[PDB]
Amino acid sequence: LDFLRFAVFVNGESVEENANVVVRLLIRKPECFGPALRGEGGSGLLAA
Amino acid sequence: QESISDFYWYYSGKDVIEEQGKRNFSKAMSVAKQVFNSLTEYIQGPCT
Amino acid sequence: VQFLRTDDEVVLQCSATVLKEQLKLCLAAEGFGNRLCFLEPTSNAQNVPPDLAICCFTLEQSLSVRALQEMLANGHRTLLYGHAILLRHAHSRMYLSCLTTSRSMTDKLAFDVGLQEDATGEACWWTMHPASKQ
Amino acid sequence: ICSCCEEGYVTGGHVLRLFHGHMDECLTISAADSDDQRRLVYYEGGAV
Amino acid sequence: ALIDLLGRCAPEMHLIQAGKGEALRIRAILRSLVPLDDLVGIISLPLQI
Amino acid sequence: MVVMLLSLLEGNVVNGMIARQMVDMLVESSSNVEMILKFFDMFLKLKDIVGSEAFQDYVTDPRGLISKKDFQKAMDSQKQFTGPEIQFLLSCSEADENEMINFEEFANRFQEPARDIGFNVAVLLTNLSEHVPHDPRLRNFLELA
């Protein structure tokens, strides 16, 4: 996640070209978000 | 063909083509010209 | 072989292995009333007949994605994997669309698919993708 | 659904009228809220 | 770090004011993944001093 | 492209299968071929209308050019071009301070670069027409070209 942050946000401007790709790859695999934010049994940020 | 179609369709709204788009189109159509000349040669004789 | 084209009425079907059985079911919707699409069983036709008047979706428009973004800003074309299409119900004469109403409770991100009264925006348009690697 | 269908000739998924004999007479269930619980079948004629 | 990356992939203010469809969709996905309640509740979660 | 299509049609029998597939390709791109042939046709007719003498009575200044409105109404008066065709001619024309369009330059700008492709297209259409004689689908292509 740290490397992804550095890959996206540079010089006080988030890159659209890489941000869209990063969020697309994040959403095609909801397993990246861990036990929370899961499709079922993910509870929430508060519970986690 | 699909790549040139996509490139044109992106440039369809902008009636004025940038110089970068012009040179990119030129090198693309040079590749297409060479492929077409390769096909002619493949079928230039009456090879059934 | 038999590549589907524009202006072809099509039923969308899928399968579920519940209780070691093959449903081979298909979606349907009653547009005037319950706009959201609901799956309708298709197996056991000899047992109970399936209602097929609400399963017909005609491919009114077929067009690429880059053409889609251009046409958004603005006969029988064969569908290609990756292209956009505009399915429309037959009885309802309303276009299939991803309704923004998140009715689904199980999957928190699941917008319930339904029927839109008019084909406006990207919600009505849908894009196919080749499931098989071949 | 449309697989080797025919136009101008009858097709599956169509809705039509089965005129018995003359076109004045037509196959039809019953009148509205009839005493047969709308289950019997007849060949009524006229406005039907 | 995950919430940082999401709000850090979030689209630009000028893109939102231009009304770009992809920017609005990315915001919609993020707002679908993380609600305002979870953000405020954890922000208001007790923090031992 | 047209040379490759001709090489496909090389050594083709009358009502040949490859000729029939070529005609199917043409009628699948029917609108596209229509606008390509139309594009060649409008500038050929533009050269002819530049040579015509009524259009010389439409040119006014001794600059040797013709105004935008004068050119538009001359095009409509000869009816060599429909309304949108004259609009597209105005789009491709070189506007001046007086709107005095260089008709000579406008006519011969596309005369030389399009000569080879137009000749190849004519060769392809003649070959297809004479090797698919009973082709009403190709009749409209021939009459538009």
- Which tokens hold the place of E14? 């000028």
> Is the distance from CB of C13 to CB of C41 less than 8 angstroms?
no
F91-111 in b/e form (b: 16+ CB < 10 A) is eebeeeeebbbbbeebbebbe
Side-chain half-sphere exposure of D22, counting CA atoms within 13 A: 5
Q: What is the distance between the alpha carbons of residues F76 and F96, in angstroms, rounded to a whole number?
A: 21
Please report which residue ranges of A1-48 form alpha helices under DSSP H: 2-8, 16-28
Supply the DSSP string of F76-136, one letter for each residue. HHHTSS-HHHHHHHHHHS---TT--B-HHHHHHHTTTTTHHHHHHHHHHHHHHHHHS-S-H
CB atoms within 10 A of CB D2: 14
The secondary structure of residue B18, as a DSSP letter, is P
> Is the distance from CB of A41 to CB of A34 less than 8 angstroms?
no
User: Under 8 Å CB-to-CB from A19, ≥6 apart: which residues?
Assistant: A8, E9, E10, E11, E26
- The minimum CA-CA distance between B28 and chain F, rounded to whole Å, is 15
Contacts of E22 in chain C (CB under 8 A): none
Q: What is the distance between the alpha carbons of residues F12 and F122, in angstroms, rounded to a whole number?
A: 18
Q: What is the distance between the alpha carbons of residues C84 and C63, in angstroms, rounded to a whole number?
A: 5
- The minimum CA-CA distance between E34 and chain C, rounded to whole Å, is 10
Q: Of F21, F96, F22, nearest to F66 (Cα)? A: F96
Q: Of C2, C109, C12, C118, nearest to C58 (Cα)? A: C12
- Which tokens hold the place of C41? 């069983």
What is the three-state SS of E1-49?
CHHHHHHHHCCCHHHHHHCCHHHHHHHHHHHHHCCHHHHHHHHCCCCCC
Report how far apart, in Å, the C-alpha atoms of C34 and of each of A12, A43, B10, B23, F40 are.
48, 30, 39, 54, 55
Type of residue numbered F98? N
Q: What is the distance between the alpha carbons of residues E34 and E27, in angstroms, rounded to a whole number?
A: 11
Q: How many helices (H) and strands (E) does chain F have?
A: 9, 0
- C75 burial type by CB count under 10 A (0-12 exposed, 13-18 middle, 19+ buried): exposed
Q: What is the distance between the alpha carbons of residues C94 and C35, in angstroms, rounded to a whole number?
A: 9
Distance separating the N- and C-terminal Cα atoms of chain B: 25
Q: Of C92, F14, A14, nearest to E12 (Cα)? A: A14
Helix axes E2-9, E21-33, angle to 10 degrees: 160
C38-40 and A13-14 beta bridge pairing:
unpaired
Q: What is the distance between the alpha carbons of residues D35 and D33, in angstroms, rounded to a whole number?
A: 7
Closest by Cβ to C8, choosing from D2, D13, D15? D2
Q: What is the distance between the alpha carbons of residues F23 and F135, in angstroms, rounded to a whole number?
A: 9
* C56 in contact with chain D, both atoms CB, cutoff 8 A: yes
How far is C-alpha C106 from the geometric centre of its chain's CA atoms?
21
- Which tokens hold the place of F110? 């596309």
Q: Of D25, C99, F74, nearest to F65 (Cα)? A: F74
> Is the distance from CB of A16 to CB of A9 less than 8 angstroms?
no
Cβ of A40 within 8 Å of Cβ of C106? The answer is: yes
The secondary structure of residue D25, as a DSSP letter, is B
Nearest CA in chain B to C64: B6
Contacts of C109 in chain A (CB under 8 A): 30, 39
Type of residue numbered B7? F
Helix axes F68-78, F83-92, angle to 10 degrees: 150
Cβ of E11 within 8 Å of Cβ of A8? The answer is: no
Answer yes or no: is B41 a known binding residue. Answer: yes
Listed resolution, Å? 3.4
Q: What is the distance between the alpha carbons of residues D11 and D21, in angstroms, rounded to a whole number?
A: 21
Cβ of C70 within 8 Å of Cβ of B9? The answer is: yes
The angle formed by the CA atoms of residues D17, D23 and D28, to the nearest 5 degrees, is 40
User: Under 8 Å CB-to-CB from E22, ≥6 apart: which residues?
Assistant: A16, A20, E11
Q: Do chains A and C touch (3 or more CB pairs under 8 A)?
A: yes
In angstroms, how far apart are the furthest CA atoms of chain F? 58
- The minimum CA-CA distance between A11 and chain C, rounded to whole Å, is 30
State the DSSP H helix or E strand holding residue D2, giving kind and residue range, or none if neither: none
Q: What is the distance between the alpha carbons of residues A25 and D31, in angstroms, rounded to a whole number?
A: 61
- The minimum CA-CA distance between D9 and chain C, rounded to whole Å, is 17
> Is the distance from CB of C60 to CB of C87 less than 8 angstroms?
yes
* C51 in contact with chain D, both atoms CB, cutoff 8 A: no
Report how far apart, in Å, the C-alpha atoms of E42 and of each of A43, A47, F41 are.
14, 9, 71
- Which tokens hold the place of E18? 């231009």
Q: Do chains B and E touch (3 or more CB pairs under 8 A)?
A: no
- Which tokens hold the place of F103? 């008709």
Q: Of E28, E18, E21, nearest to E10 (Cα)? A: E28
- The minimum CA-CA distance between A36 and chain E, rounded to whole Å, is 10
Cβ of B9 within 8 Å of Cβ of C64? The answer is: yes
Q: Of D27, D29, D31, D25, nearest to D45 (Cα)? A: D25
Q: How was this structure determined?
A: cryo-EM
User: Under 8 Å CB-to-CB from C109, ≥6 apart: which residues?
Assistant: A30, A39, C102, E29, E32, E33
> Is the distance from CB of F87 to CB of F75 less than 8 angstroms?
no
- E46 burial type by CB count under 10 A (0-12 exposed, 13-18 middle, 19+ buried): exposed
CB atoms within 10 A of CB C80: 12
* A40 in contact with chain C, both atoms CB, cutoff 8 A: yes
CB atoms within 10 A of CB A23: 21
* B9 in contact with chain C, both atoms CB, cutoff 8 A: yes
- Which tokens hold the place of F8? 């496909």
Type of residue numbered B45? G
Nearest CA in chain C to A44: C108
Contacts of A39 in chain C (CB under 8 A): 106-109
- Which tokens hold the place of D6? 């025919």
Report how far apart, in Å, the C-alpha atoms of A5 and of each of A23, C64, E5 are.
12, 33, 5
Cβ of E2 within 8 Å of Cβ of A1? The answer is: yes
Distance separating the N- and C-terminal Cα atoms of chain D: 31
E neighbour chains, 3+ CB pairs within 8 Å: A, C
